[PDB]
Amino acid sequence: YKLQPLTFLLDFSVDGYIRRAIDCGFNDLSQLHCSYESFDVESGVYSVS
Amino acid sequence: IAFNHPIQVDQLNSSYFKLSIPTNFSFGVTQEYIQTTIQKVTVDCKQYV
């Protein structure tokens, strides 16, 4: 798989290992996660680019 | 400039008192606005900028 410069939302566990991630540019939903920097966003109607 | 003086009703010194009372009804007037709500605007970031 190719690599390229992206922004991700990384979840570090207590032992410092990454077990969850999100890439902001895929699924308006994931843009919405990268904003708010959370894996849980409250329900609502959100404007998206 | 000239500011009109309001109805003057003199004050007796006897036990009587002098009063001034209306003659007509003349109902109705124009009234103010409360501006309860404001327009809601959302900006699409990464599109304007």
Automatic annotation (TrEMBL), chain B:
<feature type="glycosylation site" description="N-linked (GlcNAc...) asparagine">
    <location>
        <position position="24"/>
    </location>
</feature>
<protein>
    <recommendedName>
        <fullName>Spike protein S2</fullName>
    </recommendedName>
</protein>
<feature type="glycosylation site" description="N-linked (GlcNAc...) asparagine">
    <location>
        <position position="13"/>
    </location>
</feature>
